[PDB]
Each structure stands twice: as C-alpha cells, then as structure tokens.
DNA sequence: GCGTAATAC
DNA sequence: GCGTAATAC
C-alpha cells in the first residue's frame, strides 16, 4: 500500500551550526539474533557517536563476542532484569566516555526489569528507555500508568539540572498520524487514551519536544515498528513507537531526526538523531 | 537398555481389608496439550476417586471444556500463578466433595506460583504439590532450600491434626536407586545433596513414608520422569520424582503404590495409590 | 489470534 | 546444551 521515503540527512543547524554528535537508537528484539541477522554490520556503517539498544533479551553473561569488536563504541553499558532471562533489557554504547552512568529511575518497583540507562555527558544527559508494554488484553495497563507518572517525575528532575535527550521504544503512538490504523486500535496496547495522555503529560511536564514532529509535523506513514505477522512491514502497516525527545533548550542544536525504514534484523527499525553541540 | 514392568495392582490391605479409595497423580506438563494428546481418555479408564495434576501451565480462564465432561470427577479445584501465564499450576479433581479446600502453604513468598492445593476429607487430608525446580545451573537452589523448610513445617502442622497424604512432583530423586544415572547428576537439579537431605528431613519431621519404597524397597529402574531429549524414555533413562507420602498411621491402609510406566501424553507418567479406609 | 526470539524444565 | 509446551510482543 502506502509508502514512506525518509528524506536525506540534514547535518546543519538552523543557525548554520554543523553537526557534532550522531545518536542512534534501535529496538533489536533479540540482540543475539539481531547480531546473527547482520545487524551489527549496519551500525558500523551508520558510525554513530552513541548507540542505544532496547529489548536485548540477553543477560550480561551471554553477550556475544562481536560486541567487543566495535572499534568506535568501546564504552558499553547494559541493564538486565533481576530474574527473567530472555526478556526486556537495554544497552548503551558510546564512542566517548560518559561522566556518570546510572541505571533505572529510582523506584524499586520499576527497576526490576532493566529498562533505563542514564548516561550523563558534558553538554547534556542522555536517557535510553524501553517503556513497559500494556500488553494484549491490557493486563499491565494500570501498572503502565503508574510507570508513566514515576518516569515523568524522574525525567523532570534530570532536566532540572541538565539538558536532556530521551530515546528508545516509548511504546505509544502519540497521535493518529503516528500509526497506520488509528481507529481500530483505540482499545489496544500502544494507542489507548491513557497511554496517549501519558505521553502528552510527559512533553508538558519536564518539558520535552518530539524531534521528528518538530521537523516534520505533518509527515504521515512514517513508522518505526511493524508487527511480524500479517506481512505488516511489506504493507507499511506500522506504528511510530521509537522517539527522540529533547529539552526545549536543545532545539537550536537539532539538525535532523531520521527514520531508517529499510534496515532489517528486527521488527523495529533504527532511528538517528543529529545534534550540533 | 534396562526395563521395568510395574507389578499387577494389589487391592487388599495387609490386614485383609479391601480397597476404598483410588488416588492418581500426574504431572501433565501442559494440561491443554495433554488433553490434546488423549490424556483424558486415559484417566477415564483408570477411574480414580481423586485426580491430582501438576505443571498444568494453564490459567483458570483457559481451562478446556472437556474437563467439565468428566462425569466421575465433577468437583474440580485449580491453583495458578499470580502473574506468569504458562508456568507451574496444579489441579485437584474429586469424585466426592471435600470438607475444606485451601491453597498454598501459608507464606506469601512461596504462594505466588500456584504449587499446592490442600483438600481435607473425612478420614484424612490430601495435599498435592509441585515443588520448585532448582533449575539448570542451580539458580533457585538457595530458594529451593528455603521452600523445603517452610513446606516441611506446613506439612508437619497438618499431620498434627489429621492423617496426611502428600502427592505430586516433588522434584527430587531420594536415593541412588531413584534415577538411572546417579553419579553424573550429583551436581544437577534433582539429585543435589541439599535437595536429597531436604527430602530426608521431610520424612523424618512430619513424619511420612515413601509408599513405593515401603512396598518395593529394592526395586530399581522404576522411574516417573523421562527427559524429552536424548530419547530418554525409550531407553528408560529416567528419574523417580513423583511420590505418594503417607502418615505412619495410614500404612495399615496402604494396598499398593503403582507407576503407570506406559501412559503417554507427557514427559512424566501417572502414579496411582490404593488405600483401604 | 499470528511471526519471531527467548524462555523453564 | 536438547525436545516439548507456553509464553511476551
């Protein structure tokens, strides 16, 4: 059906400033099978300054050896669930050394599934996240609302002291333009009133801006996730669940927020952010 | 390799008393696939007064309709994990109505996985259990030891007021005769020193007697579980993990403790107990 | 429900 | 590790 071709990368700030930092985020949905699907040859080409991975499904002991073979991303940090083995998990790889690296959001109820790494750098503080899925039948919908409130107060406090960049799978399509089939999904995980109101309260509270919508407020059919079933990806029946939210003070540095719709290895695709620090 | 033919059923007490009650236990390892594997036609033939199922892997909402089509086992009771969906789970079906039915062992740490049903009858109190597996690599070995102590104090208190029958997957081979390959499994879940000492402390504390060993103290190669891998069952490379433990006062009623080595539908086989109440 | 990656045992 | 039954998403 309908198509989307991501525009060419703009590497120049609105004030003419050239791009310094290139961040990349990707929900790999199985880091080991992603590695097996030649996913790591792709990021070697993208050459990002920072790499954020979500849904690694891989305890820190089982990490493949080819991760230690990325000559430009040697500082690697991982978070994993306390108990469950092939579930959730996030990772943050960096070309430069972070000043401080912290894990989780400071409330033990939400820190048992390895969902958040916080990497503080010189000019800003990066946060990569993998928000809990409300799940089919919406069993975790009530829990998800408790998470969103505590995650918002956690982010609001970080931005209080330093410019903030949130990134990763946020497991919500903000608006009707952010998914292919809006009407039939008002009662499904990812496009419920409560999840969408929560994303809205996030932008308003810390505060943050959706990078992609700030540069392309009216671009439709631009998705980051496609269900493996029903040939969803070949038909571009997708969802935009992967984001880059910036502090308002960082918008003069924003050069481009990209969506690599063609990169394989996962039921998500990578997203890239160009900043000028 | 070596073989085992379960002897014919003895339905007469040592004191000449005839059999009243016929209990049956079976770790079905997937109640729905077990039903699909014609497992329920088997128990219709066995015609037991009570049926105990372990590792149902089936929440109470997803129970098949053919369970309500057992005309001789209409009183059905189920336990399931609080959160995990296709994991653990035990069930107790009965021809007669129990006086009281309780769930779990009275300590919330061990009651979140649906492992114990307690059914009090007129002459005795039946308990069916599915003991936590220490797991490959023995991650739950320390937890398993905490369970065994609390499960023993729970059983010791039940037998304090009524004769007791424990049954189900106890996830331990007591002695070297209770598994095919004793030497190579001293460091594996099911035949560790700690698990075996725990089973021993159980028999001594409440107290209880292994029905099968009381009637066949020297019968080897008699297993209830066979790994699905390595063609373990066709080679009788097995483990005796499924038991019937009685209060000492009930031994004059014991007629026979059986092992149906030939019944399919699971990587465990059913066990049957004949009592004369 | 259906595709895929990981599980416990 | 390998067979099988169930998972989350």
Residue numbers in the entry:
A (entry chain A), B (entry chain A): 41 to 317
Authors' own words:
As an exonuclease, APE1 digests both matched and mismatched 3′-termini of a duplex DNA with a nick, gap, or recessed (5′-overhang) structures; the matched 3′-end is involved in numerous physiologically important pathways and is more resistant to the enzyme. To reveal the molecular mechanism by which APE1 conducts terminal processing of dsDNA and distinguishes different substrate structures, we determine two crystal structures of mAPE1 complexing dsDNA products, including mAPE1 bound to a blunt-ended dsDNA and to a recessed dsDNA.
In addition, the crystal structure of mAPE1-recessed dsDNA is also determined with the substrate sequence identical to that in the mAPE1 blunt-ended dsDNA structure except for the longer 5′-overhang. However, the structures of the 5′-overhang segment and over the region 4-5 base pair away from the active site of the bound products cannot be superposed. This result indicates that the 5′-overhang affects the binding mode of mAPE1 with the dsDNA substrates. The channel is formed by Arg176 and Met269 in two separate loops, which interact in a bridge-like fashion (the RM bridge) across the active site. Formation of the RM bridge is induced by protein–DNA interactions since Arg176 interacts with three dsDNA bases via hydrogen bonding as revealed in both the mAPE1 blunt-ended dsDNA and mAPE1-recessed dsDNA structures, and the RM bridge is not present in any of the apo-APE1 structures in the Protein Data Bank (PDB). As for recessed dsDNA substrates, the binding affinity with mAPE1 is higher than that of the blunt-ended dsDNA.
